[PDB]
């Protein structure tokens, strides 16, 4: 008797048992080595979709530019990037006509937001391309380097605090003939020592001023870094993703804020709608389309998906979109909003590491940097790369980068593109034919409803929608998209079948131990179960099972099995002692080899708070010792409820930096850290609330400490000695 797990689908329908078609217990595919091939693929294809447009050499950068917009319409189903401005403007006019006031209101909100937005805002951009060192760095560091660099070119917009002067300095820095910036280099110095030879050589780092010419700077300012996307689910082959510089961030923020402020008020945009609310939108949007045409009215649903979404959409359109949307706004704001598209219209793409060539005979390998990419016979590359490199040539730059005028990068203008999709959804009809379409949009993923009298019309409506989208540079995936009679459909891995079904598989990877620490991961671990019980349809048995499995994973990961158990380990050896010593054993946390007291009803309660009354005074005292060394200097995506105890620790820093030339940044860091740690002692609220001021960081401390001294004296805390000493010290400062 041959078992067939598919035969379940004879009994239970596919949506009802959709969880079993997701292999999320398995491993997701990671990348290996270089992504240059994947980047080059994108560069070639992006131009492949627009090569019948207008080619021209940029007199600024000296790069090869291609312009599809207002180009010849396609005569085939190959991904077209040839959008038509007029049609976009009409699609916009329709949206404005049906949503009047939104266009200017959103702009005013975004403007009034911008005006308040400070520079520090840029620090929360995660990985950012640092143009000074030409590497992906933390946003804060990439920003700091850019500010310190700007300071050398007499650009102190940052000192004012606001974003506007900084952005001004950014667009101004383009005019600079030679951009100067710091670069660190080492120096030997004989420090005194008790070392036979009475001295020691420590390489003290020192900063050096380095110059870049206007063009070479502009090229970096316009550059985008690239890397293969790891762990991307539900796909065979890998692909590339990009990272932006510090310059464009401020200009994108505003545009996305605007597009957000717009999208929020649209009813056919699924962004920034929470996954839970997306159903509230979708099911209703369906309910509307259902009861609209009773008499033989065939309501069809189309499970949409777009191809080459990023590689077809052109900045030149987004510029027009900003220009239209900002109609009523003043000029400076239009000029402000217009910049990011202008940059993306003239952007440059970096090609990652390169390609590794080898000899099996000699067992040798070597990476060929993108500059040296062509310093070799093309026959020595493999068959595909040989084809790619030939096609890359016309868009290739001397310094080893690829010019890329058309197309967008993976995840840049999500909002503003979603708007362009909704704009397609806004037409609803063409030529007064007997049908009406509506739908929901989300970047490259869309769901299209079409109501009409007979399906022959519906299909022509869908065809009209397709042919329409072509004019916006939006390309529907004939291969991945499919249509059916309304009642069931799929949208961003959410499955509707006369009501959205659960897809428990999707969230299953989150059940594991998160990797923050013992304290947090518990809270997270229970909270995930608690939430998945509510939203994703997990019964009490399965939930209670997950409660067990998580503790199982938790105790192995953090090596903290039951104190009564006999599992051996360095920690366990002490845990057992703690078990023997402690009286209120049920008061012990699992991290301390305590018993799991959680169940369905108290998932939402922190373990410490649960067990507090069961703890011994010394144990809770030690566990919650106010000045314990394990918890660091805290400072106020999902958040959790947890208590700050000894299990709330932080791990060691990655030490690989120690034996590289970036050692400096440790001293550069700690140099700040000292000043900030002190400034926090002077101003305790600094940790909570962002301090404000364009004045000197020292001045504040001086004044504050002076007042502290004076008041501590006159109140009767400090003695005349301490006051005179304090004032004597401060006097010098």
């Amino acid at each position: 008797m041959n078992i067939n797990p598919y035969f379940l689908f004879i009994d239970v329908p596919i949506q009802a048992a959709i969880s079993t078609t997701f292999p999320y217990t398995g491993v997701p595919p990671y990348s290996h080595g270089t992504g240059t091939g994947y980047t080059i693929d994108t560069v070639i294809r992006t131009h492949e979709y627009s090569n019948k447009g207008k080619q021209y050499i940029s007199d600024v950068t000296g790069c090869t530019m291609v312009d599809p917009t207002n180009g010849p319409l396609p005569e085939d189903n190959e991904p077209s990037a040839y959008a038509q401005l007029d049609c976009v403007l009409e699609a916009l006019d329709r949206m404005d006509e049906e949503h009047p006031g939104l266009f200017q209101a959103a702009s005013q909100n975004a403007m009034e937001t911008l005006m308040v937005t400070t520079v520090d805002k840029l620090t929360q951009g995660r990985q950012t391309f640092d143009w000074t060192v030409c590497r992906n760095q933390p946003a804060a560091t990439a920003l700091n380097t850019t500010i310190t660099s700007f300071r050398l070119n007499d650009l102190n917009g940052a000192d004012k605090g606001g974003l506007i002067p900084f952005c001004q300095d950014i667009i101004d820095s383009l005019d600079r003939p030679e951009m100067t910036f710091f670069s660190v280099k080492n120096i030997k110095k004989k420090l005194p020592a008790k070392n036979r030879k009475g001295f020691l050589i420590k390489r003290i780092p020192m900063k050096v001023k380095d110059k870049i010419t206007k063009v070479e700077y502009i090229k970096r300012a316009l550059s985008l870094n690239t890397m293969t996307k790891d762990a991307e689910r539900g796909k065979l082959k890998r692909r590339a993703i990009a990272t932006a510089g510090i310059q464009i961030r401020g200009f994108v923020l505003v545009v996305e804020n605007l597009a957000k402020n717009i999208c929020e008020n649209l009813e056919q945009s699924g962004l920034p709608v929470g996954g839970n609310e997306k159903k509230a939108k979708l099911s209703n949007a369906v309910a509307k389309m259902l009861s609209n045409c009773p008499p033989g009215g065939i309501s069809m649903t189309v499970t949409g998906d777009n191809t080459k979404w990023n590689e077809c959409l052109n900045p030149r359109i987004f510029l027009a979109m900003t220009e239209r949307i900002t109609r009523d706004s003043p000029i400076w704001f239009r000029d402000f909003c217009s910049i990011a598209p202008v940059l993306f219209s003239n952007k440059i793409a970096r090609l990652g590491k390169g390609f590794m060539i080898t000899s099996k005979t000699k067992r040798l390998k070597a990476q060929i940097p993108c500059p040296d990419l062509f310093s070799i016979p093309l026959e020595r590359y493999n068959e595909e790369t040989r084809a790619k490199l030939k096609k890359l040539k016309p868009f290739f730059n001397e310094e080893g980068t690829a010019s890329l005028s058309p197309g967008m990068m993976m995840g840049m203008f999500n909002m503003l593109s979603t708007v362009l999709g909704v704009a397609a959804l806004g037409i609803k009809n063409i030529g007064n034919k007997e049908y009406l379409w509506d739908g929901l949009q989300s970047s490259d993923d869309f769901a299209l409803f079409v109501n009409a009298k007979d399906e022959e019309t519906c299909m022509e409506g869908i065809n009209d929608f397709y042919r329409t989208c072509k004019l916006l540079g939006i390309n529907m995936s004939k291969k991945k998209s499919y249509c059916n009679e309304t009642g069931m459909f799929e949208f961003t891995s959410m499955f509707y079948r006369d009501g959205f079904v659960s897809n428990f598989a999707m969230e299953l990877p989150s059940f594991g131990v998160a990797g923050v620490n013992e304290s947090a991961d518990m809270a997270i671990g229970m909270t995930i179960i608690k939430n998945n019980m509510i939203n994703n349809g997990m019964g009490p048995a399965t939930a209670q099972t997950a409660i067990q499995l998580f503790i199982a994973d938790y105790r192995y990961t953090y090596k903290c099995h039951r104190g009564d158990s006999k599992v051996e380990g360095k920690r366990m050896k002490i845990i057992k002692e703690l078990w023997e010593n402690t009286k209120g054993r049920d008061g012990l946390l699992v991290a301390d080899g305590g018993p799991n007291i959680y169940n369905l009803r108290n998932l939402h309660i922190p373990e410490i708070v649960l067990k507090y009354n069961l703890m011994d005074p010394e144990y809770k005292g030690r566990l919650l010792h106010p000045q314990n060394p394990f918890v660091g200097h805290l400072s106020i995506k999902m958040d959790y409820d947890a208590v700050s105890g000894t299990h709330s620790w932080r791990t060691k820093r990655n030490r690989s930096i120690l034996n590289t030339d970036q050692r400096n940044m440790i001293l550069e860091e700690q140099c700040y850290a000292k000043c900030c740690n002190l400034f926090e002692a002077c101003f305790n609220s600094a940790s909570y609330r962002k301090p404000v001021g364009q004045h000197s960081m020292l001045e504040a401390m001086a004044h504050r400490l002076r007042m502290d001294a004076r008041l501590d004296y006159e109140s009767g805390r400090m003695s005349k000695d301490d006051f005179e000493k304090a004032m004597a010290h401060l006097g010098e400062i």
Binding site: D159, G487, I574, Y612, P617, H625, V631, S644
Partner: protein
């Protein structure tokens, strides 16, 4: 400590780097240089942790005495190492070091801990003190709504909350004084007193404060209970296919009762309306309804709120009826006069037409807003008199404005400028009057200017006031500031007074069916009856399938005996009363077709049998109303197709599987032999039979308007479901 700070400052300033950093860096830029580090963003912490936990010294300590109290090793086990951490510049250590510290470390001060983390403990007492009830299996309609996740101390906007936190924790650094301080001075005082002696770091106190001040509102699937202290237990309260009665401990709000009470009463009424002798049901149910812990009796008795349904029930059990209304912030009680709403179109001041329900008839209310009290006398679009007391300026003002708007005066309607069709922050369109309220509450100058003035009362006890809420000789037209501060119920739930006049209309309650706040319980058999559309639909069809054995048999014996059955009364309470009869008359006929003639369809019989309860309504001709789909109350989804399947009801003849609101049922072993090639046309229209198949010469698929107008004995084409043409005759 100051001396130490200054000394450390001087020691730091020696370092030219630190000096230049302190001199060059700005107070703004502090926010940047703080986040400067060599650290990188961990893209796979789930892995990196599992890896790191297998290393020797994964953790980093803080440099200090408490670190030095930890020994290097302990009974062979290496606790920590000499090597410093790059970030902390303190020693590194193994996780064991934690387990040591917890076992043999220094015992620290934990006084205040409970008050600091009070917010969390309140959950623990809200669970520990709670009491659980019954668990019931059966369908549950979950409505996805934004709700408050946790109960707060006092809800504020983030900006307002942070300032309070700042006032509590860092009073010297609060900066510019806000009004908030004066409003929450008692809260500040309290938290200041409660969090004084503790040793815990302020940054934690601010977090816990912000947790219990700032609100966490999120979209969730909810059914019944929506109060925070219910939401926090939501995972246990319900599923899709089960319900759990839960009674949380601690005190509960009055408004939370007032919220649910209304829904409960409305829901009782909506059911009891359809069944003859409504009062009987209403009383039967209301007697045994429960709001969380309080009976509906105790609630209606104790609370002085209600609206319409509440009074009707109040008069059904026997107690006073507070005819009170709420216009946003304005609270009204009825002194005399019963007005009637009439939908008209008004051309409002700014120059736009608006469909508004104008209230005809004279009316007199006892009025209160915040602290300001008064008496209101109004007529159809006119403030006749407004006799108020003196109070705070904003209350007097808002009282007068809310009265001006509530009165629907033309002087108000013709005092609009710009636009008044703005949505709320979520993006929802407010109602015509509440928009005018939200508008004139802000921009009142137009109203006050457009209103008009007149002579003040010269009676000693009376006074008049002007636009700025100050005494004046020229008062606002119709405004006065004075110094001085049985019933029975019908079978059909209308309240009559001794003089024969009726004051409450059974058909005067709101059809709007909102989610309650607390646990709405019905301590009776057949709870479902007071349920949602789909719940009732499902339970009904289930009850049909459960008794199909007898119900299908009696249909060959008892003529109209089945059509009326206890269970169907509920179902009918779903159906629009304007269609119930038309549906019943059709269903009964289509069924009678399958009875009297030799063409049965069990799947259809089951589908239609519930619709036949309500007394039928045929056309003038004697023929019933033909239908494509039978619509139900609420949600465009909720309808039963006649030819095709539908979101609520569909049938799969391949597996003989009946789908009801998603749930699967098996009809196998309960189907006749000849239902194989038995077309559906013989149970789609009443008094119609399939002759042949689609004959092009007959033309197109004829619609209901045509089919009803066709003469008896006349062929026509009909489309069952997509791709199934049929040739039918009358």
């Amino acid at each position: 400590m100051t001396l130490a700070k200054i000394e450390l400052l001087k020691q730091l300033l020696r370092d030219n780097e630190a000096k230049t950093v302190l001199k060059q860096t700005t107070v703004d830029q502090y926010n940047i240089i703080r986040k400067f580090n060599t650290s990188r963003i961990e893209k796979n912490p789930s892995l990196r942790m599992k890896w790191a936990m297998c290393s020797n010294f994964p953790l980093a300590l803080t440099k200090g005495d408490m670190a030095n109290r930890i020994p290097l090793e302990y009974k062979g086990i290496q606790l920590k190492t000499n090597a410093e951490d790059i970030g902390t510049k303190g020693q590194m250590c193994s996780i064991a070091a934690v387990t040591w510290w917890n076992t043999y470390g220094p015992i620290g001060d934990t006084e205040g801990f409970e008050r600091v983390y009070e917010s969390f403990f309140l959950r623990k007492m809200r669970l520990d003190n709670a009491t659980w009830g019954r668990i019931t299996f059966g369908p549950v309609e979950r409505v996805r709504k934004r709700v408050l996740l946790n109960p707060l101390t006092k809800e504020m906007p983030p900006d307002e909350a942070s300032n309070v936190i700042m006032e509590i924790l860092f009073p010297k650094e609060a900066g510019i004084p806000r009004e908030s301080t004066w409003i929450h001075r008692e809260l500040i005082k309290e938290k200041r007193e409660k969090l004084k002696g503790t040793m815990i770091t302020p940054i934690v106190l601010a977090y816990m404060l912000e947790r219990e001040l700032v609100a966490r509102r999120r979209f969730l699937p909810v059914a019944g209970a929506t109060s925070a202290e219910f939401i926090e237990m939501l995972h246990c309260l319900q599923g899709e296919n089960w319900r759990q009665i839960y009674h949380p401990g601690g005190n509960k709000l009055t408004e939370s009762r007032s919220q649910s009470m209304i829904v409960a009463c409305r829901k009782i009424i909506r059911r009891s309306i359809v069944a003859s002798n409504p009062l009987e049901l209403a009383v039967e149910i209301a007697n045994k309804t429960v709001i969380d812990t309080e009976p509906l009796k105790s609630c209606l008795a104790a609370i002085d709120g209600g609206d319409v349904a509440c009074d009707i029930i109040r008069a059904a059990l026997g107690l006073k009826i507070r005819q009170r209304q709420r216009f946003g912030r304005l609270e009204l009680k009825r002194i005399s006069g019963r007005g009637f709403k009439n939908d008209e179109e008004i051309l409002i001041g700014n120059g736009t037409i608006q469909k508004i329900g104008i209230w005809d008839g004279e009316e007199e209310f006892h009025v209160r807003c915040g602290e300001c009290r008064g008496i209101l006398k109004k007529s159809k679009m006119k403030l006749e008199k407004l006799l108020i007391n003196s109070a705070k300026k904003e209350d007097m003002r808002d009282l007068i404005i809310l009265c001006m708007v509530f009165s629907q005066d033309t002087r108000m309607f013709q005092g609009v400028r710009g636009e008044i069709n703005f949505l709320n922050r979520a993006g929802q369109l407010l109602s015509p009057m509440y928009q005018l309220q939200r508008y004139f509450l802000n921009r009142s100058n137009d109203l006050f200017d457009q209103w008009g003035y007149e002579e003040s009362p010269k009676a000693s006890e009376l006074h008049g006031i002007n636009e700025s809420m100050n005494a004046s000789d020229y008062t606002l037209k119709g405004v006065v500031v004075t110094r001085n501060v049985k019933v029975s119920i019908t079978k059909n739930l209308s309240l009559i007074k001794r003089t024969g006049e009726v004051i409450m209309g059974a058909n005067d309650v709101s059809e709007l069916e909102s989610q309650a706040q607390l646990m709405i319980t019905y301590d009776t058999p057949k709870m479902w009856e007071m349920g949602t559309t789909k719940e009732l639909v499902q339970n009904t069809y289930q009850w049909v399938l459960k008794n199909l054995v007898t119900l299908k048999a009696q249909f060959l014996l008892g003529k109209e005996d089945m059509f009326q059955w206890d269970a169907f009364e509920a179902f009918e309470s779903i159906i629009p009363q304007k269609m119930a009869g038309q549906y019943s008359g059709f269903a009964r006929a289509v069924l009678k077709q399958m009875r009297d003639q030799e063409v049965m369809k069990t799947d259809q019989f089951i589908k239609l049998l519930p619709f036949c309860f309500s007394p039928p309504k045929l056309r003038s001709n004697g023929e019933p109303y033909q239908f494509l789909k039978l619509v139900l109350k609420g949600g465009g989804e909720n309808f039963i197709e006649v030819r095709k399947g539908s979101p609520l009801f569909s049938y799969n003849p391949q597996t003989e599987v009946l789908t009801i609101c998603g749930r699967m049922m098996s009809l196998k072993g309960k189907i006749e032999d000849e239902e194989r090639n038995r077309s559906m046309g013989n149970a789609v229209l009443a008094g119609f039979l399939v002759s042949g198949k689609y004959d092009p010469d007959l033309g197109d698929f004829k619609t209901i308007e045509e089919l009803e107008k066709l003469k008896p004995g006349e062929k026509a084409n009909i489309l069952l479901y997509q791709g199934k043409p049929v040739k039918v005759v009358k």
